[PDB]
From a paper:
In this study the crystal structure of the Fab fragment of 7C8 is presented, providing the first structural analysis of an HIV-2-neutralizing antibody. The antibody 7C8 was originally isolated from mice immunized with a 15-mer peptide, derived from the V3 region of gp125, and corresponding to residues 326–341 (SGRRFHSQKIINKKPR). The three-dimensional crystal structure of the Fab fragment of the mouse monoclonal antibody 7C8, specific for the third hypervariable region (V3) of gp125, reveals a deep and narrow highly hydrophobic antigen-binding cleft with architecture appropriate for a linear epitope.
The overall structure of the 7C8 Fab fragment comprises the four immunoglobulin domains VL, VH, CL and CH1 that form the variable (V) and constant (C) domains of the light (L) and heavy chains (H). However, it should be noted that the conformation of all the residues comprising the six CDR loops is identical when comparing the 7C8 monomers 1 and 2 in the asymmetric unit. Five of the six CDRs in 7C8 (H1, H2, L1, L2 and L3) display conformations that correspond to canonical classes 1, 2, 4, 1 and 1, respectively. The CDRH3 loop of 7C8 comprises 13 amino acid residues and is therefore elongated with respect to the average length (8–9 residues) of mural IgG molecules. Qualitative analysis of the electrostatic surface potential indicates that the two sides of the deep antigen-binding cleft are positively and negatively charged, respectively. Importantly, besides enforcing the importance of the FHSQ epitope for recognition by 7C8, the two models provide a potential mechanism for neutralization by 7C8 as the size of bound full IgG or Fab fragments would not allow for subsequent engagement of the gp125 trimer with the co-receptor on the target cell.
Numbering used by the authors:
A (entry chain A): 1 to 52, 52A, 53 to 82, 82A, 82B, 82C, 83 to 100, 100A, ...
B (entry chain B): 1 to 30, 30A, 30B, 30C, 30D, 30E, 31 to 212
Amino acid sequence: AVQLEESGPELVKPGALVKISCKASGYTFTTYDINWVKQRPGQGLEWIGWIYPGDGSNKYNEKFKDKATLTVDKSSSTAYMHLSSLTSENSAVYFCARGYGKNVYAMDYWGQGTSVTVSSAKTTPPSVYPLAPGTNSMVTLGCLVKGYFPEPVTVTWNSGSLSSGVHTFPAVLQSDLYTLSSSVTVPSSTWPSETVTCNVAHPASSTKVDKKIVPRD
Amino acid sequence: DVVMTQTPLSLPVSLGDQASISCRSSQTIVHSNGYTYLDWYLQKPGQSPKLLIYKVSNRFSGVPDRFSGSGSGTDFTLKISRVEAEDLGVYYCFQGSHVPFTFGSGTKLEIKRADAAPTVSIFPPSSEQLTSGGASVVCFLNNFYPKDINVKWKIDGSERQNGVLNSWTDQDSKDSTYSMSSTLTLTKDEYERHNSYTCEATHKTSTSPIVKSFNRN
């Protein structure tokens, strides 16, 4: 199974340097191009360059030649991107993709991406607050995820058991802090006769919070 | 640079109908060696871009035959026949013939469905939050079609404008509806100063607003 594992989120101060890493498995690393693609918050994909791990040859897009440096480590089958002189406008999601080689003619396997935030703000974990009602046969419960930094935050209900009726909203940033909510709808005969719990992850602070939703007294 | 221009930027297609995306290009994507490295990608909300079509017409393994690509040199097309709800996301044409490799701008595929009223739910601030000295009031507006919606908050029956943050979902991959969340954030003191808190949605599906309220006691 061809796989590409990219590093976790990064918070770095303006005018700093980051080293983004991408570990390959499931194919001969040294015989396929590795590509990088930028994606800014909002829309759009932009190709940065490829490296050929076999001999370390590369091609860069002119625009990124001064900000992006591509290296490789054969021994660990890892590809690396270094981003330099960091501005706010450099805050983006950067992708890894295996490209040209034997029987491959496009970017067929992509990494999960690495979100890079450039801010002078401080990493801070979320406070997760429960949201319970004040028989319809359908009841909507929720979690408020408030005051975390940086993005992202993943929300999951009962360790993934409930996928249906789950809405997690895009975060809204105010005063260097993000807030999102997530809602889940379940049949009334299953709450609060059974446990409903939201699971919030914040990879940048390495924090998982699991809040159980209990009725008001 | 080979400019990739995609038309349209938005594609509203009904469920089951054909959807076609046009990609035009500055130069010829026909490479020196004779091959045409023109690819189509798909980026679903919150996911990596995935390969759909390579070399103009060849579809990547695991991609259903519902997707087919055609065209030559300067002009290209991708057709999705019999569209399903999970097909929504952003479609990119991409050239790998002339350095730098370039993507088109996005073609956002939205689907059309029947009208749906929002399920409105209001939540007082949790005990946990009040203890911190903050008081968020969250209102959910769930599973409605189409996009357009507004929220009016009332503290003590009087419209409150300052202190409100909103967030809208991308189109849902299952039932094809949109969703929204609104959060009135106060201090425990400001919150304790008043008594009634109402959340009201106006949608095109009703004359009257859906009013959900609670009293602080």
